[PDB]
Write an enzyme that holds these catalytic residues in place. Sequence first.
Site, PDB file in Angstrom:
ATOM      1  N   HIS A 112       0.703  -1.212  -0.041  1.00  0.00           N
ATOM      2  CA  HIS A 112      -0.040  -0.023   0.018  1.00  0.00           C
ATOM      3  C   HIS A 112       0.639   1.214  -0.014  1.00  0.00           C
ATOM      4  O   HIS A 112       0.291   2.477  -0.109  1.00  0.00           O
ATOM      5  CB  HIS A 112      -0.928  -0.029   0.970  1.00  0.00           C
ATOM      6  CG  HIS A 112      -0.661  -0.098   2.548  1.00  0.00           C
ATOM      7  ND1 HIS A 112       0.247   1.122   2.941  1.00  0.00           N
ATOM      8  CD2 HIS A 112      -0.776  -1.007   3.658  1.00  0.00           C
ATOM      9  CE1 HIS A 112       0.093   0.980   4.247  1.00  0.00           C
ATOM     10  NE2 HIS A 112      -0.184  -0.415   4.691  1.00  0.00           N
TER      11      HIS A 112
ATOM     12  N   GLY B  47       2.158   6.288  10.047  1.00  0.00           N
ATOM     13  CA  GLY B  47       3.724   6.120   9.800  1.00  0.00           C
ATOM     14  C   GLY B  47       4.389   4.972  10.134  1.00  0.00           C
ATOM     15  O   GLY B  47       5.396   4.608   9.823  1.00  0.00           O
TER      16      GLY B  47
ATOM     17  N   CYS C  13       3.436   1.847   9.565  1.00  0.00           N
ATOM     18  CA  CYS C  13       3.464   0.698   8.504  1.00  0.00           C
ATOM     19  C   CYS C  13       4.807   0.281   8.368  1.00  0.00           C
ATOM     20  O   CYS C  13       5.787   0.948   7.861  1.00  0.00           O
ATOM     21  CB  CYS C  13       2.512   1.087   7.450  1.00  0.00           C
ATOM     22  SG  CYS C  13       0.584   1.537   7.869  1.00  0.00           S
TER      23      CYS C  13
END
Lengths: 301, 301
Positions: free
Chosen positions: A41, A143, A145
């Site tokens: 993503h 942030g 991820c």
Amino acid sequence: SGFRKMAFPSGKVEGCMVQVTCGTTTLNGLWLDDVVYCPRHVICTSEDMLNPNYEDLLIRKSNHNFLVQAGNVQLRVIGHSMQNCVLKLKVDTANPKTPKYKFVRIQPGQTFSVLACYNGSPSGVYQCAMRPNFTIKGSFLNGSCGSVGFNIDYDCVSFCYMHHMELPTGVHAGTDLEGNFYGPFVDRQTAQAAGTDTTITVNVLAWLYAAVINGDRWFLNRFTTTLNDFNLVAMKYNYEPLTQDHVDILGPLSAQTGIAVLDMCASLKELLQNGMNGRTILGSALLEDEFTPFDVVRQCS
Amino acid sequence: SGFRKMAFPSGKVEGCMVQVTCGTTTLNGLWLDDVVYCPRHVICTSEDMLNPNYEDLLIRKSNHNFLVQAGNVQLRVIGHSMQNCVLKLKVDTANPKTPKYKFVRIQPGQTFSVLACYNGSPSGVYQCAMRPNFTIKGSFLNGSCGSVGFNIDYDCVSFCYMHHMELPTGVHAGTDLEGNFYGPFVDRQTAQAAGTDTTITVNVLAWLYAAVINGDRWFLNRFTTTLNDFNLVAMKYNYEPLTQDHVDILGPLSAQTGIAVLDMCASLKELLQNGMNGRTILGSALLEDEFTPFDVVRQCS
Ligand SMILES: *[C@](C)(O)C(=O)N(c1ccc(C(C)(C)C)cc1)[C@@H](C(=O)NC(C)(C)C)c1cccnc1
Ligand SMILES: *[C@](C)(O)C(=O)N(c1ccc(C(C)(C)C)cc1)[C@@H](C(=O)NC(C)(C)C)c1cccnc1
């Protein structure tokens, strides 16, 4: 003596954290040998998150669109591929700090350490467990991820989790290092409900053994029970069923303390039916289920 | 979202852990530049622990009696001295992995990360706080002496604790990196009782602010209080007095949530007088006091 939520020393994993940017989006990547692993993503935009077609979005991306930064050093991307929900960015330099590692898909109930990162920089480390409903109760902000979960056994790091997202519940969902999500979750901004979160019975019992080793013995009683009679109480309080494999896994703990597994099950049954009556066990006023029998033998002996 | 007991990434400190042996005794040392810091009780023997005369015991020790091992590498000792309860072993090689560091004597109520070590090898990392009675509620086993406590601010490691011993209570006592014990404790196998352990009021309030930020808002009420009226309730439940400095330190949290400090004090007062009524706050059934306002702003924003 003492008992704490203890994480593995994070040093081996800190040396692997990098920053990955693709357009406007920046998240964390894992750099092992000449590959950087990150959530796919990273290629999504604001008006693409509801139902992204990753194969179509990736067509418009070339090696030079992926900016990988390890500290103040830029890495050169020479190849890219999608594997399930993870991107693999081949870089031209092997990570000099790559530890001995393996990718493992953990079972629910098992625990691991999380190194929460922002912009490729490690911020903190904590313990968590894969919930029976395949979520994790982490501590993650925007942030985070790409932050990873791992276990360390004799200098070998076994990576088991990569953080992808937060559900509207406030719990976290992610994948193994092959990109397969734990549970039924999908990488898109959609309605995703977690199932019933049951208590990890074998872990609570392991924690009761840790409490006995530490001097907390008030909960021990004059009673015993059977696997089937305990499981009737377990089902009522949403505790996962206990099997003979769980009894066997608790063997070292039962032998070190001299307390039979079914006698500890009877103490657990009394605690489930009566509560703690304002008292505490190992500094907690709830039954703790995020310590496996392994975590107990490692920290108590 | 989420809230966990989060430790600093331990990598910078792992690179500093060494093994120190002196005779039969082996414990951990901290290697920074060309000095190894360790508990002075490494020079004690079985029939010397009740009342050791460290100055006399050290007379019989030369540089070659201190075996320092960093991994599979032996360090050469070229000097030795005693500073309070810590030994400083000058070695002929500077640690190549020495981070930017400083020694800090922390105040009670402040928190820090502990890297528990055995035989110079790091085993795990967890969060703890200096209790108002100058003990720490750690998780330490035989061989853990020399394990250090630290904080990390912008690549600078501030060392604040070195583990020396366990009290008969099961709580832990130790020194700052200058060898001065926190509290009235002495490095000898004697009768040492800890004082009354009070609750860190400013930390509980910071944790109530973290709960509000995370969606846990049930405890918020329609009432308010004064510093003096709250402190009457605080003294009754063995909570440390709250001052205007504590109110000021909570400023960022009160401004981010829009909830005045005295309104949060009234919610705390109701929780102290009524309890939690079987409910939970941030996954806990007790009032948590081992997160400072700094720890809350770092992990919640
Ligand atoms: C990652 C990108 O760092 C992140 O912060 N979150 C995130 C944003 C967007 C996605 C998409 C592109 C929708 C798949 C996934 C993850 C963020 C979220 O999970 N946010 C949403 C999906 C909007 C709830 C995040 C927040 C808090 C903790 N973890 C992740
Ligand atoms: C250190 C040496 O690793 C250790 O394990 N402990 C310890 C042994 C002996 C001393 C003397 C020489 C008596 C000052 C101090 C510390 C150990 C203890 O604290 N043991 C006693 C003093 C016998 C209770 C220890 C056990 C558990 C946790 N921390 C330290």
